[PDB]
Design a protein around this ligand. Structure first.
Ligand SMILES: OC[C@H]1O[C@@H](O[C@H]2[C@H](O)[C@@H](O)[C@H](O[C@H]3[C@H](O)[C@@H](O)[C@H](O[C@H]4[C@H](O)[C@@H](O)[C@H](O)O[C@@H]4CO)O[C@@H]3CO)O[C@@H]2CO)[C@H](O)[C@@H](O)[C@@H]1O
Length: 445
């Protein structure tokens, strides 16, 4: 019962600019879609916003240091587009300088970075122009991806293009639940096609510059089980699987959308009119690795309701996070397995986000987060059984170095291995972070 991981296995943590940085009106930065969205009554638990957050804008030196001391080799962060492109075609030099310095600190501690170009903080001025439902957005993206790549990239070992196109498009324009908060399936599907092109856009800029860094997109995926053996339930689960995974995984690897999904969406796709000649080829570029974010599985059953997919998530109460999310590590094994067979057929796979939000309690200045630790460990064994069976898992970034703006959940949800005290801003590593330090040292509990 030992779990030793490969020699070269990549151990990191991740964050995201809007969720940790704060300094929203500082340093030339202008409002993102989330600064607006967060203000709409009822959209984010408690009214919470990304103002201040963990204030990583001023604390960046100690955070990257706390990583070093926690025995991390890799750090995955994102760049806040609004810090870089605060208005149309301007290039804010003070914003580039924050990341440059952040990168100085990174290399000073001897850490290896991964920069995510897009992690959901679209500059509002772009949403004003139409947001992700306009092709022109892609040109703006180009502008933004070009600056970051000239300014860095002799320096960046790992490029991550889009984080989770599913959330920014589907939840962003479709269900309303993420910024900017639209409820329009036509837009959602239009936006998903544009964001997926930006991965391509950025993949082209990367080769035209001849950079040596690895590059890849990140999809959030979810394993999907039918609720019962009834056929309409089996059908239901096929639809959920197409809706999160195949709609985004298919174009990237095979240059097409899932036909059953295209048939199901029908009128909302307006005959794929948003697809110009050459787009799908632009999209279909798996690059150097597949980034995956995984948290839980869905148990799906069919309904005959008014929703796009006509599906119901059966709400499992068995081991769950503070988010109602079920801990089912076996399913992380079955998802990794399926990703290799379809789509990724030998390309390196990186888990760019994996973690859990449990209720925390400070006790004698320590955090006994046995749930979070239990959850990480279990999924790491699921990650282990997949390696050994010939799985191309090369890396694993624990989601969230720090407790942070947990989107629509606000600050009510804590995913950090390092506890943030929002009254004083002081960082305090939790028992799980101490566990992760011993684990990377022995390279495998
Ligand atoms: O929040 C931290 C974390 O989250 C990630 O983004 C998450 C979201 O937090 C979350 O809101 C979201 O929840 C889903 C869910 O997976 C679906 O089952 C669901 O589908 C619904 C639907 O909204 C209805 O239209 C319909 O009638 O049925 C179904 C249920 O049957 O909708 C929601 C949104 O409410 O999903 C995300 C994961 O996919 C990030 O991925 C990550 O970075 C974060 O750390």
């Amino acid at each position: 019962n030992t779990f030793i991981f490969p020699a070269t296995f990549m151990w990191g943590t991740s964050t995201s600019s809007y969720q940790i940085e704060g300094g929203t009106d500082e340093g030339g930065r202008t409002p993102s879609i989330w600064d607006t969205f967060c203000q709409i009554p009822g959209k984010v638990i408690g009214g919470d916003c990304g103002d201040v957050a963990c204030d990583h804008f001023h604390h960046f030196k100690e955070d990257v240091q706390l990583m070093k001391q926690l025995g991390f080799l890799h750090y995955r962060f994102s760049v806040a587009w609004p810090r870089i492109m605060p208005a149309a075609g301007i290039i804010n030099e003070e914003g580039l300088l924050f990341y440059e310095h952040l990168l100085d600190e990174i290399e000073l501690a001897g850490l290896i970075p991964m920069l995510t170009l897009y992690h959901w903080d679209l500059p509002q001025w772009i949403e004003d122009e139409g947001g992700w439902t306009q092709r022109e957005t892609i040109q703006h993206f180009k502008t933004y991806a070009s600056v970051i790549m000239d300014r860095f990239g002799e320096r960046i070992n790992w490029w991550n293009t889009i984080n989770e196109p599913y959330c920014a498009s589907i939840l962003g324009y479709g269900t309303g639940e993420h910024a900017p908060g639209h409820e329009n399936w036509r837009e959602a599907f239009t936006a998903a096609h544009h964001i997926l092109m930006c991965h391509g856009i950025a993949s082209n800029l990367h080769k035209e510059k001849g950079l040596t860094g690895k590059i890849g997109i990140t999809l959030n995926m979810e394993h999907v089980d039918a609720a019962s053996e009834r056929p309409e339930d089996v059908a239901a689960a096929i639809r959920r699987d197409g809706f999160i995974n195949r709609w985004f995984a298919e174009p990237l690897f095979n240059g097409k959308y899932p036909e059953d999904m295209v048939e199901w969406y029908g009128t909302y796709l307006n005959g794929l009119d948003f697809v110009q000649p050459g787009d799908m080829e632009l999209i279909q570029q798996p690059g150097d690795f597949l980034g995956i974010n995984y948290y839980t599985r869905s148990i799906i059953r069919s309904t005959n309701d008014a929703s796009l997919l006509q599906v119901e998530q059966v709400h499992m109460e068995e081991p769950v996070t503070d988010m109602g999310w079920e801990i089912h590590p076996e399913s992380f094994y079955k998802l990794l397995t399926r990703i290799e067979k379809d789509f990724s057929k030998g390309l390196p796979i990186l888990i760019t986000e994996n973690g859990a939000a449990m209720r925390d309690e400070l006790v004698n200045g320590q955090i006994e987060d046995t749930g979070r630790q239990r959850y990480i460990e279990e999924h790491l064994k699921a990650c282990h059984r997949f390696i050994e069976e010939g799985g191309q898992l090369k890396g694993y970034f624990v989601w969230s170095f720090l407790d942070n703006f947990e989107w629509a959940w606000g600050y009510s949800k804590r995913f950090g291995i390092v506890h943030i005290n929002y009254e004083t801003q002081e960082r305090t590593p939790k028992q799980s972070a101490l566990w992760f330090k011993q684990m990377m040292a022995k390279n495998g509990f």
